[PDB]
Write a structure and sequence with these properties.
3 copies of one chain form a homotrimer.
Chain A: H1 2-33, H2 40-60
Subcellular location (chains A, B, C): Host cell membrane; Virion membrane
Protein name (chains A, B, C): Env polyprotein
PDB class: viral protein
Chain lengths: 61, 61, 61
């Protein structure tokens, strides 16, 4: 069970890396059309959910 | 162990929020070029996988 | 506990499917502007993190 939870955690940490890579790409795509001022709130939500996850990951470890 | 599974669940729920935010952004980006008729199947898969996850999250709780 | 870890795993597997769908869409969006030569490294990271996750998923099962 313990080892199993360890694996699940690593899976989640790796997926978070994937998530951040897609976020970075999306921003690049957005930046193409012009300024990202209209994505301020979107950015705020992404940042906030990312913080929650970092907290949870740190807590799980 | 119990508390640990609780954390893993919250991590997964937060990541799902991130996932849906990237999906929403992607759709906005697509909508820029024009109609999203060509993404009907893509949308169907996204919706279906999202349902599975909602079911699993509800079940885990 | 055991059944709970099983659910968490399925949740993670479903989210990975979602992740790969967003990656595929992002690539399509990128391909619109032209060649994706500038995304070689981005692609390498996505592929590498996806491999880690596949390994972890296989190991968890």
């Amino acid at each position: 069970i313990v080892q199993q939870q360890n694996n699940l955690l690593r899976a989640i940490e790796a997926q978070q890396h994937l998530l951040q890579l897609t976020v970075w790409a999306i921003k690049q795509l957005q930046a193409r059309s012009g300024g990202r001022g209209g994505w301020m709130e979107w950015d705020r939500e992404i940042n906030n959910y990312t913080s929650l996850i970092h907290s949870l990951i740190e807590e799980s470890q």
